[PDB]
């Protein structure tokens, strides 16, 4: 169905068609350069200007203005319909999940005398995410991901999310010492990223690609006839969500094997957005399409030698010959019912080993639905209770909280 919002947008004829923000730092994060790249569409005029202003609450921190016309990039010239503005920020307040310091960037398209055509705005967090020496660093410090997987689920409305349930989830996550959320396994509603900017949660943004049911699992993702369909799902996610400071890691999807389409889309993201690592689990969690070893349900001390995709123990996995990447479990500690036995063994290992940087618990909320029996009394239904066949019964309910957000 139509499960998210429908809206109408009226734009002027000459308009801002796209804008990118990127933050670049010195060695001790005392000087930042906000590089803003604004694109227009419509008819170019020489009186058109772009002002990018940066605001910390009510005070204005930086500002720049420029006419259109980019730098020369090749033999044919540059982009006549693009600008790049570089704003110097001295001692910026850095964004993290601990302290979610945000700035407000306002992009004004206006004429040279000064009448405004259109303004756009986004929240800006100064943060750098990079992998050096095998460690995922945020602002020069190694992260420990206290993460949880979260589906968009409401027991009455299905997959329709409103703001009040999102705020209820984020408060319960931070009150239970979570600092990260994995968007499993699709891009969320756009308000979710804004709220994770505001309250402070790291977000793994994940493309809407899963072909778990295929035999073999990479039957579509190793086929170049499906590369246009897969690329749209990746490129339009990155184009929608690249300005959010809470998004720190891109994910190529879930459980799609490992085909050549993943390697191509991995390298596409590293080209357009070098500021975020890319992870991908399929094909054994340590393929060339991932910056981070991200196994699903690998154990702490026990190996699981499956043919061609073994799940090593996470302590062994780090020490395999030639292996240098950090390890962050994209799913671990499957919370199905009365579960999370041995959860302390993961967190003993996370604190002991530097390259084990945590993981994402599967998962946040039970996907149970509400039915009514005969007296109008509601009851929680799982797979099979709607006549669906075949179904997977109670494997839909893996949450740390019930569907009405009361805790397990």
> Residues annotated in the binding site for Na(+), as ranges?
395, 398
Asked whether the beta carbons of 394 and 366 are under 8 A apart, the reply is no
Q: Report the site for a copy of itself in 277-306 (rule: CB under 8 A).
A: 303
Per-residue H/E/C for 377-403:
CEEEECCCCCCCCCCCHHHHCCCCECC
Residue from 108, 206, 281, 331 carrying the catalytic annotation: 331
Q: Figure out which of the listed residues 41, 80, 320, 344 binds a copy of itself, where binding follows CB under 8 A.
A: 320
By residue count, the chain amounts to 408
Closest separation in Å from C-beta 286 to a copy of itself: 14
- Give catalytic status of residue 331 as yes or no: yes
Q: Does 324 bind a copy of itself (CB under 8 A)?
A: yes
Tell me which of a copy of itself, Na ion, none is bound by residue 320, counting a contact when its beta carbon lies within the kind-specific cut-off of 5 to 8 angstroms: a copy of itself
Q: Which does 17 bind (CB under 5 to 8 A by kind): a copy of itself, Na ion, none?
A: none
- CB nearer Na ion, residue 17 or residue 348: 348
Please list every residue from 13 through 52 that binds a copy of itself, using CB under 8 A: none
- Among the residue ranges 167-175, 194-202, 323-331, 388-396, the one whose residues contact Na ion (CB under 5 A): 388-396
Min. distance of Cβ 399 from Na ion in angstroms?
9
130 makes contact with a copy of itself (CB under 8 A):
no
How far is it, in rounded angstroms, from Cα 278 to Cα 95?
20
Least distance CB 247 / Na ion (angstroms): 22
Whose tokens are 């891009």? That residue is: 187
Using CB under 8 A, which of the segments 24-32, 270-278, 314-322, 362-370 binds a copy of itself? 314-322
Least CB distance to Na ion at residue 145 (A): 9
Chain position carrying tokens 């086929």: 223
71 is known as an active-site residue: no
The residue (of 292 and 318) whose beta carbon lies closer to a copy of itself is: 318
Question: Least CB distance from residue 332 to a copy of itself, whole Å?
Answer: 18
395 binds Na ion (CB under 5 A): yes
The answer, yes or no, to whether the previous bond of 390 is cis (omega within 30 of 0) is: yes
**CA within 13 Å, CB half, 60:** 8
CA of residue 361 relative to chain centroid, distance:
16
The entry of Na ion, a copy of itself, none that residue 395 binds, CB within 5 to 8 Å by partner kind: Na ion
Binding-site member from 7, 352, 375, 389 for a copy of itself (CB under 8 A): 352
> Which pair of structure tokens corresponds to residue 236?
């339009």
Of 120, 206, 255, 302, which one is the catalytic site residue? Answer: 255
User: Residue 79 in contact with residue 18, Cβ under 8 Å?
Assistant: no
CA–CA distance, 46 with 308 (Å, rounded to integer): 60
Residue 354 CB, shortest distance to a copy of itself, in Å, is: 6
Choose from a copy of itself, Na ion, none: what does 20 bind? Cβ within 5-8 Å by kind: none
- Of 22, 204, 189, which is closest to residue 97 (Cα–Cα)? 204
* CA angle (366, 252, 333) in 5-degree steps: 35
What is the DSSP track for 102-148? -EEEEEEEEESS--EEEEEEEEE-B--EEEETTEEEETTEE--EEEE
Binding partner at 86 among Na ion, a copy of itself, none, C-beta below 5 to 8 Å by kind: none
Which residue of the chain is nearest Na ion when measured via CB?
395
**Residue closer to Na ion (CB basis): 259 or 277:** 277
Q: Please give the radius of gyration of the chain, using alpha carbons only, rounded to the nearest integer.
A: 23
| Subset of residues 342 to 371 that bind Na ion, contact rule: CB under 5 A | 356
362 in Cβ contact with 334 (< 8 Å): yes
Cβ distance to a copy of itself smaller for residue 322 or 407:
322
Between 133 and 239, name the residue whose CB sits nearer to a copy of itself. Answer: 133
Residue 134 touches which member of a copy of itself, Na ion, none, C-beta under 5-8 Å by kind: a copy of itself
| Residue 402, burial from CB neighbour count under 10 angstroms (0-12, 13-18, 19+) | middle
Q: From the list Na ion, a copy of itself, none, pick the one residue 352 interacts with, judged by a Cβ distance below 5 to 8 Å according to partner type.
A: a copy of itself
C-alpha 130/C-alpha 122 separation (Å) is 23
Residue indicated by tokens 């720190």 = 248
> What is the torsion angle, in degrees rounded to the nearest 10, for the CA atoms of residue 181, residue 185, residue 186 and residue 192?
-20
Which residues make up the interface to a copy of itself (CB under 8 A)? 133-135, 303, 313, 315-316, 318-322, 324, 352-356
Which residues make up the interface to Na ion (CB under 5 A)? 356, 395, 398
Active site residues: 255, 331
């Amino acid at each position: 169905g139509i499960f998210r919002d429908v809206s109408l947008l009226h734009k002027p004829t000459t308009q801002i068609s796209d804008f990118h923000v990127a933050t670049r730092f010195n060695d001790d994060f005392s000087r930042a350069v906000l590089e803003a790249e604004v694109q227009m569409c419509g008819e170019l005029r020489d009186y058109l200007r772009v002002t990018v202003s940066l605001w910390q609450g009510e005070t204005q921190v930086a500002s720049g203005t420029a006419p259109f016309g980019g730098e020369i990039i090749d033999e044919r010239g540059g982009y006549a319909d693009r600008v790049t503005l570089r704003l110097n920020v001295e001692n910026p307040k850095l964004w993290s999940a601990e302290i979610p310091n945000l700035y407000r960037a306002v992009v004004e398209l206006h004429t040279a005398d000064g009448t405004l055509i259109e303004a756009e705005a986004c929240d800006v967090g100064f943060r750098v995410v990079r992998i050096e020496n095998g460690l995922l660093l945020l602002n020069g410090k190694p992260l420990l991901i206290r993460g949880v997987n979260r589906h968009e689920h409401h027991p009455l409305h299905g997959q329709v999310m409103d703001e009040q349930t999102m705020v209820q989830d984020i408060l319960l996550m931070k009150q239970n010492n979570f600092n990260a959320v994995r968007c499993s396994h699709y891009p969320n509603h756009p308000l979710w990223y804004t709220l994770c900017d505001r309250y402070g949660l790291y977000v793994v943004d994940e493309a809407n690609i899963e072909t778990h049911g295929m035999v073999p699992m990479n039957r579509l993702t190793d086929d170049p006839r499906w590369l246009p369909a897969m690329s749209e799902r990746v490129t339009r996610m990155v184009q929608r969500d690249r300005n959010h400071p809470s998004v720190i890691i891109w994910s190529l999807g879930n459980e799609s094997g490992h085909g050549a389409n993943h390697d191509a889309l991995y390298r596409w993201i590293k080209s357009v957005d070098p500021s975020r690592p890319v992870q991908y689990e399929g094909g054994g969690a340590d393929t060339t399409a991932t910056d981070i070893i991200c196994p699903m349900y690998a154990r702490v001390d026990e190996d699981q030698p499956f043919p061609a995709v073994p799940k090593w123990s996470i302590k062994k996995w780090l020490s395999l010959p030639g292996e240098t990447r950090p390890l962050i479990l994209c799913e671990y500690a499957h919370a199905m019912g009365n579960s999370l036995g041995g959860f302390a063994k993961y967190w003993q290992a996370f604190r002991q080993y530097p390259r084990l940087q945590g993981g994402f618990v599967w998962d946040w909320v039970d996907q149970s639905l509400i039915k009514y029996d005969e007296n109008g009394n509601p009851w929680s239904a799982y797979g099979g209770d709607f006549g669906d066949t075949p179904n997977d019964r109670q494997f839909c309910m893996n949450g740390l909280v019930f569907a009405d957000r009361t805790p397990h």
